[PDB]
Amino acid sequence: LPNYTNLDLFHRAVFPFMFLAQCVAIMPLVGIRESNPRRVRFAYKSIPMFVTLIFMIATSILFLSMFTHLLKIGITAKNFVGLVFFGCVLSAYVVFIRLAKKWPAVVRIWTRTEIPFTKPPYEIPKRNLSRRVQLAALAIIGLSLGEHALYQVSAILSYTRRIQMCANITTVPSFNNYMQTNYDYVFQLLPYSPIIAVLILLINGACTFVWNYMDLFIMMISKGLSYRFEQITTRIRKLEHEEVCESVFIQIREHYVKMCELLEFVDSAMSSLILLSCVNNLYFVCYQLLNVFNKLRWPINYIYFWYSLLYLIGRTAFVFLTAADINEESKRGLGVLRRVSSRSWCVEVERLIFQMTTQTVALSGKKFYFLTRRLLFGMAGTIVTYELVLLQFDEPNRRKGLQPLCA
Amino acid sequence: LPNYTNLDLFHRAVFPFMFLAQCVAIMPLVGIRESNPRRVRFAYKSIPMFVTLIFMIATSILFLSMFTHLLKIGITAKNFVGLVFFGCVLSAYVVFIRLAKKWPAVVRIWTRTEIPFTKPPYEIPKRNLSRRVQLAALAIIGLSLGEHALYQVSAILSYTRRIQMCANITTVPSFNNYMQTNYDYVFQLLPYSPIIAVLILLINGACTFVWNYMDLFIMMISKGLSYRFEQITTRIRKLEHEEVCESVFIQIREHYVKMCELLEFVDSAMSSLILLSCVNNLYFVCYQLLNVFNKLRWPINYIYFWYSLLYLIGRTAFVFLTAADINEESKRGLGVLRRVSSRSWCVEVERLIFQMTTQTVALSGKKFYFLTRRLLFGMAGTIVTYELVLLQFDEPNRRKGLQPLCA
Amino acid sequence: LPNYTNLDLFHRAVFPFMFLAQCVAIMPLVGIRESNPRRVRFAYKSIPMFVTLIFMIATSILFLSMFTHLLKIGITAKNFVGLVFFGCVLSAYVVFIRLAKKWPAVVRIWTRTEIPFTKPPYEIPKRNLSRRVQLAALAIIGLSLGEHALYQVSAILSYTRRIQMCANITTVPSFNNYMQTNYDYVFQLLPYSPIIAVLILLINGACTFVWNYMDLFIMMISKGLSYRFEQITTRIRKLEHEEVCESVFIQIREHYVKMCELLEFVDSAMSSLILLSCVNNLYFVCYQLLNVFNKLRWPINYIYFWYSLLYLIGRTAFVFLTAADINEESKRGLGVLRRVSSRSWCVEVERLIFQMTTQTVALSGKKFYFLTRRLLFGMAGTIVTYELVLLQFDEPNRRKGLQPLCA
Amino acid sequence: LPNYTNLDLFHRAVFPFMFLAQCVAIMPLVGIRESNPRRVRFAYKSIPMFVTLIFMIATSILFLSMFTHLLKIGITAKNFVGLVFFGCVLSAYVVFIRLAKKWPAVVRIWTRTEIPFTKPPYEIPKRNLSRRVQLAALAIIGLSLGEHALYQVSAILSYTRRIQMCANITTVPSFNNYMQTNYDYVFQLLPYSPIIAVLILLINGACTFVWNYMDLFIMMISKGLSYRFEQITTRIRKLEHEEVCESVFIQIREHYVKMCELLEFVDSAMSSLILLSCVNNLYFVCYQLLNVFNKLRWPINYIYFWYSLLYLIGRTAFVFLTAADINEESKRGLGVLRRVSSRSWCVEVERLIFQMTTQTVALSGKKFYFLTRRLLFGMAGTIVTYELVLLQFDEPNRRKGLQPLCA
Ligand SMILES: OC[C@H]1O[C@H](O[C@H]2[C@H](O)[C@@H](O)[C@H](O)O[C@@H]2CO)[C@H](O)[C@@H](O)[C@@H]1O
Ligand SMILES: OC[C@H]1O[C@H](O[C@H]2[C@H](O)[C@@H](O)[C@H](O)O[C@@H]2CO)[C@H](O)[C@@H](O)[C@@H]1O
Ligand SMILES: OC[C@H]1O[C@H](O[C@H]2[C@H](O)[C@@H](O)[C@H](O)O[C@@H]2CO)[C@H](O)[C@@H](O)[C@@H]1O
Ligand SMILES: OC[C@H]1O[C@H](O[C@H]2[C@H](O)[C@@H](O)[C@H](O)O[C@@H]2CO)[C@H](O)[C@@H](O)[C@@H]1O
């Protein structure tokens, strides 16, 4: 069996971040850190599943808290976002659990599909798969941490500044008063306690991490697939000005077909996650864009809002672009295959060219749409249309303006 | 001739529900229960056609009643739905009559097209065609019965609760007073009578059954076609890792071509029904979605509205997905055909792959659109756009709020 | 040379209606009635061109009259339609003149392209080209005459009924007073005279005929092309269950390629007319649809408005469907070519199937769009979206209601 | 080495206008006027880069002036256009700098790709590349000069007429007072001085030239590519009725593949410029179209507004059409290749036909969209939808009307 310890495999590239997600109980798999992907298994009776149940119970508690609070104070389009967040997070857990159920098979096939690309005539690119995954995942994680830190800083500064410059009822600033005020949707259902306060903070952080990790996981999977497609493209490019025997084209076509089979399997496994991430990203992007013209009190509020909006748009665009890189890489070999000489042309090259030309090699949202650059352009156009139609809805709200600080 | 009694044929699978629809005079065919599909014929002078004429006359009476009532009280976008319902139902009858005219030919060809798939190398899947049709049809019928029961319960409870808690003019609750009130659009044209009351109730039930049976029939036909396409895909999958002679590919391509010819014939026969069902579903889904934010008096009213909306959306999505399963199954064999070895590759495999790749194997609405997953995604996007643009139209109505119970 | 007198050619089919259009100076060609299409020529110094100049001068006079009248009374979205009409008509003349410039070449090639289809193995369908053109053109002409008659009747009845039931200033009804009132946009610039009145009526009738003849001419051309494509499809169908030699496929492919070349040439010639007709139809359909909810005084006003709206929508749909029948007929032979036996399969069948599959055989609006069923569906969706967005613009106008009859 | 002095090459065709753009420091390349394209190089330490830095510093000064002025007076959707202009211009500089970085490689490959087309069997068309580029560039430059002259004339006439017919506070017209008034967004940050006034006028002219030169450069590049594609199409047409040896098709396919490689390279180089130009054109076209119904004081104001709107729409349409001419020319050879005889048909013709049919030979905006006639039609439809939705936003502004002249 191959030595998985040092090989440049997808599982080795992604298992650190899969374990980081496990820490917040995202995808409950057993032995995700094992070097051999064959040792990855899904077990309902396991510590990861127990932590997942705990986190899902707590997220359900938070979702019920938000639902009851909004019912008490009435549901508004602006309030609803909160519920949606928790809803999405809960959905994510369920989706990821199902994904975990399918992950072993997937990872197994993935490994056995990518062993041929770890040996000649395929070479490791300048940026190996582990480095690509690390760079993208660290960027996403750092940006999400910055977004949540800005959220917390904006909330705390708004609360403290309101109290300080209120020049009216004081309610001296404190951790407990802030916890009861900003998170009143929770403590209006559960008795307040500092331990519960820290728990709610940690659980909100975990929910935010899950919310970002849906997109992060889609990104890592897209990198893993486009890496092998790029290796195939590079191998084909190496045949640019050479007479190529039929056997070379046979092997290239077989490897491309295996890569497409792996893409189909992974797409079937991940279609639910892709659909959930796409719908959640669209909703949140539209909601934040509808608030671009709103007026906020403090400069920190503007900083947080614009950082969140830009980060969300960039994360959506980056996930879509990373997923579409699979399609772009699949099509990139067509230009080199079209240069095959008349002497080297054979039935195998014709078959491969036909498959590259007519097959859509891309991740899909349950085959309702395919993650391509054209899809990202259409999503941008749809978002623009929705924003144009919706900015009329909130025009009265926009002209309401900032409320009095004292009130 | 083949023994139709026990064979796993489409006609055997669907004739129970076709006869159930005949009971409400949907598709007036003679000998629909006959085991031999060759004995199915369309006759204008027949009991099914007489019942169809009676039901169409009664539906025309109801439609005229609604038209005159709305003219008397003025036509509003909210009132119009009622007329549309009856209109659609009447259209359905006409469409189905035409479909009946074409059904014998269709069924005949269908039978002779599916005889090859009842013998090796094709095997019956885990869920045979009869079981698939039964499951889907029973689900649709039960959900429609639940929807109509909730409609009746909501109307009756609203009427009775209004009268009881009116604390004003009493008009003690009774069957006759409810019949005159809720169905005043009928009795404002016809003299009231309990027999006419029961007749109107039964006729409204029949109209609802027709309204749901358009989608149900499209679903059963889609199941019948995708069943044979799935059998072809399974047979191709059985050739995954074997050297295949040219004769096997010849037979596979011929069976696929026959299946596509059957799909073309059935699509030509059913294009009118598909178009009518699509337009009716779109209109009703948009109309119900425009009322999501409206305020209803009783919890039963909310239960009925949301059950109806969710059932309608799910029925539209399920019909579209079942129809698109034909296209998905047709394309599913391409992946296996792309794995054919260089030794087994021949002109027949190339022909079949070209046909699967470039031909759109799907039901269509008169070729204006094709029932695919992409079409369902586009329909969802179009519905979202229409709802966004239309929620401004009814904003004044939404802010009107609930009327006084006494008034 | 072939005997053009009795042959079933496009020129013989369409020249009666081309001459009818010449009577109103639409397409100024010389010798359009000649049996030999080679005798058709375009001459600037000719009676048709003189009549075209006279009609264009008259239409410019009417357009200037409308422009000055609207400037005097201010331009409104409702008034603008009038100007647009004349503008379109003027554009049509120019376009048709250019079309006339290209018609001889076109007709010549057309004739020499369709001679092979007048002899075996091609047979004349049940409805020959002359009968198809006659039926469609007579339907369009009769419906346009009915539309204009309803327009005149509605205007005259509105005027006379207003005067009669005014119960105020009388201005006894007369031809001259009606001419000065309804056509005040003309006589406000030119001194009134009964001769000028009859001239304005005749010139308005000619403008209406041109407005309808753009669509009519597109329809006849589409019939001419789809006729030969249908003949090709029928010839291919005749090879359904026969072993076919390579020569038969060679001839079929050559005839199909010649038909596609003729379609390309005709599309290049007629792209301007197609674009103008499409834009004019879209504008007028949207404008009329925006007035569906408006309230009109008399039942004749409703009759005229709804006849005009239904006729316009039906004419647009029929032109689009007739043009798309070319594409449908081109694709109809693919199903029969896919049934070719393995023994009869050759490079010629593969070439023909590839061309039918991948080539878009359809008329186009300068290649910006192609006249297909999908395009008609997209046009319907675009019209629905535009109407939804625009019904908000005229909501104040809709709630204005009918003006007082006396005022 | 080939004699570049007299050859009909792209670099010879475009270098005069590239140098004209260099005069305003658009694309800082060294030796752009050199007859040998191999002598074109990009150097940060060079006079072109120094002038580019000066112009970018000036444009940043103007952008900061506009930003501070709008902050002082509040940002409105109408004011924002100004900022956008400068922003785009600044972006253009950056983009063009990057383009300059890539230009040498590009031009080099371009030259070596187009040497084969300067010799038989390719002939120079009636309009050689230099003449096509000269005509289009002179048209664009003259129209831009007219647009800016109309802008300046409208501003000056509005200012002078206001002062003269004010009949109130006079502030006798002068160059300095006009400079301080119309360009108050500048002098509100920098102390006024006539030298600074002339500098601001010249720098605004340079910014306008850059704004138009983005589209102009895209146009010239599109002409350069479609020229060679048209030469290929003409060479193929020359084989219309001849038996063609396999070697001729080999050479034609190789030249077509080289042209497609050049298109891919140029598209990769110019995708940023195409995206920026497309977004800027869309924004400005929508903004100007939103002001069509606004009321302006003087006839010169209407003349300037409509000249600017028509010129902008025509420039967008012309850039899109010139870019799509590459795709149209690539597809134009398919019709002639489909006429190849059965005797001359070979694997090379099949390969070439497959590539022309299935490959999208067009410039693209980073592969998010492709510059085709269909894309221009979709852009027109999107603009219409945006204008319909947006005309509701500015309806209050439209009904505000013209402000008092004295105020
Ligand atoms: O809207 C994006 C933000 O979502 C989360 O914020 C939660 C918050 O944690 C929770 O207390 C409240 O009930 O709902 C919001 C979302 O509506 C993230 O914590 C933020 O970083 C995001 O900006
Ligand atoms: O709107 C969906 C409902 O359609 C039917 O309800 C009819 C009703 O039977 C009839 O009396 C009235 O005139 O019109 C409505 C439809 O507008 C079904 O009976 C209901 O189950 C559906 O919910
Ligand atoms: O709007 C469709 C109608 O167009 C013509 O009507 C003209 C009319 O002849 C002319 O006097 C007036 O100035 O403008 C209208 C069009 O705006 C046709 O004559 C009518 O048949 C059409 O209904
Ligand atoms: O809007 C198109 C116009 O853009 C430029 O005009 C500038 C102007 O030079 C500058 O002083 C001002 O600050 O902004 C506008 C653009 O918003 C061109 O100079 C004009 O020719 C164009 O019409």
CA pair distance D132, A324, nearest whole angstrom: 37
Q: How far is the CA of D204 from the centre of ligand 4 (A)?
A: 8
Helix (H) or strand (E) segment spanning residue B143: helix B129-164
Task: Confirm if A259 and A232 have CB atoms less than 8 A apart.
Answer: yes
Coarse DSSP helix, strand, coil percentages of chain D, rounded to the nearest 5 percent: 75, 0, 25
CB burial string A327-354: b at 16+ within 10 A, e below: bbbbbbbbbbbbbbeeebbbebbbbbbb
Task: Confirm if C30 and C41 have CB atoms less than 8 A apart.
Answer: yes
Q: What's the domain range around D116?
A: 10-400
Residue showing tokens 């658009």: D26
CA pair distance B362, B354, nearest whole angstrom: 16
Q: What is the largest CA-CA distance in chain D?
A: 89
Residues of D in contact with A335 (CB under 8 A): 260-261, 264
SS3 B364: strand
Closest CA to C336 of C242, C228, C205: C242
Residue D30 dihedral angles phi and psi, to the nearest 5°: -105, 135
**Residues D257, A391: C-beta atoms closer than 8 Å:** no
- The residue of chain D with its CA nearest to that of A321 is D368
Which atom of ligand 4 approaches the CA of D147 most closely?
A: 21
Q: Give me C17's structure tokens.
A: 């209606």
Length of chain D (residues): 407
Task: Confirm if A298 and A305 have CB atoms less than 8 A apart.
Answer: no
| DSSP E strand stretches across A186-344 | none
Asked if the structure places residue D41 within a domain, the reply is yes
Q: Give me A111's structure tokens.
A: 């490994």
Task: Confirm if C376 and C282 have CB atoms less than 8 A apart.
Answer: no
Does residue A247 belong to the interface with chain B, where contact is any CB pair within 8 Å? no
D233 lines ligand 4 (CB under 6 A): no
Q: Give me B323's structure tokens.
A: 């129809």
**Residues B257, C345: C-beta atoms closer than 8 Å:** no
Q: Residue positions of C in the annotated binding site for sucrose?
A: 82, 147-148, 185, 208, 304
B147 lines ligand 2 (CB under 6 A): yes
Task: Indicate the burial class of C46 (C-beta count within 10 angstroms; 0-12, 13-18, 19 or more).
Answer: middle
Residue showing tokens 């003149």: C97
**Residue A188: DSSP 8-state:** T
**Residues D392, C390: C-beta atoms closer than 8 Å:** no
- What's the N-to-C CA distance of chain D in angstroms? 70
Asked if the structure places residue A2 within a domain, the reply is no
SS3 B399: helix
Asked if the structure places residue D392 within a domain, the reply is yes
CA pair distance B186, B202, nearest whole angstrom: 14
CA pair distance D364, D372, nearest whole angstrom: 9
Task: Indicate the burial class of A55 (C-beta count within 10 angstroms; 0-12, 13-18, 19 or more).
Answer: buried
CA distances from C214 to C26, C42, C88, C137 (A): 9, 19, 10, 12
> Pick from D342, D377, D388: which is nearest to C368 by CB?
D377
- The residue of chain D with its CA nearest to that of A332 is D264
Residues of A in contact with B384 (CB under 8 A): 386
Interface test with D, best of C351, C364, C394 (most D CBs within 10 A): C351
Closest CA to A117 of A13, A15, A256: A256
How was this structure determined? It was done by: cryo-EM
CA pair distance D349, D338, nearest whole angstrom: 9
- The residue of chain D with its CA nearest to that of C247 is D342
Asked if the structure places residue D407 within a domain, the reply is no
Residue showing tokens 């077509």: D256
| Residue type, position A299, single letter | P
The alpha carbons of chain C give a radius of gyration, in whole angstroms, of 25
- Starting from the CA of residue D154, give the closest ligand: 4
CB atoms within 10 A of CB D333: 22
Asked if the structure places residue B4 within a domain, the reply is no
Does residue B369 belong to the interface with chain C, where contact is any CB pair within 8 Å? yes
Q: How far is the CA of C73 from the centre of ligand 3 (A)?
A: 18
Q: How far is the CA of D273 from the centre of ligand 4 (A)?
A: 20
> Pick from B257, B369, B389: which is nearest to C338 by CB?
B257
CA pair distance A374, D378, nearest whole angstrom: 13
Asked if the structure places residue A371 within a domain, the reply is yes
The alpha carbons of chain A give a radius of gyration, in whole angstroms, of 25
List of chains touching C (3+ CB pairs within 8 A): B, D
Q: How far is the CA of C237 from the centre of ligand 4 (A)?
A: 64
Q: Residue positions of A in the annotated binding site?
A: 82, 147-148, 185, 204, 208, 304
Closest CA to B387 of B276, B278, B288: B288
Does residue B336 belong to the interface with chain A, where contact is any CB pair within 8 Å? no
Distance (Å) from the C-alpha of residue D382 to the closest C-alpha of chain C? Answer: 10
Q: Residue positions of C in the annotated binding site for D-maltose?
A: 147-148, 185, 204, 208, 304
Task: Confirm if D388 and C386 have CB atoms less than 8 A apart.
Answer: yes
Task: Indicate the burial class of B170 (C-beta count within 10 angstroms; 0-12, 13-18, 19 or more).
Answer: exposed
- DSSP characters over B27-67: S--BSTT-SSGGG-B--SSSHHHHHHHHHHHHHHHHHHHHH
Closest CA to B366 of C357, C215, C325, C319: C325
- Starting from the CA of residue D143, give the closest ligand: 4
CA distances from D265 to A341, B87, B191, D105 (A): 21, 59, 81, 9
Total structural domains in chain D? Answer: 1
Q: Give me B192's structure tokens.
A: 């009231």
Asked if the structure places residue A4 within a domain, the reply is no
Q: How far is the CA of C213 from the centre of ligand 3 (A)?
A: 15
CA pair distance C342, D165, nearest whole angstrom: 89
Does the bond joining A121 to the residue before it have cis omega, within 30 degrees of 0? Answer: yes
- Starting from the CA of residue B210, give the closest ligand: 2
Can you give the three-state secondary structure of D15-41, one letter per residue? HHHHHHHHHCCCCCCECCCCCCHHHCE
- What lies within 8 Å, CB to CB, of C23 at 6+ separation is none
Asked if the structure places residue D288 within a domain, the reply is yes
Task: Confirm if D106 and D266 have CB atoms less than 8 A apart.
Answer: yes
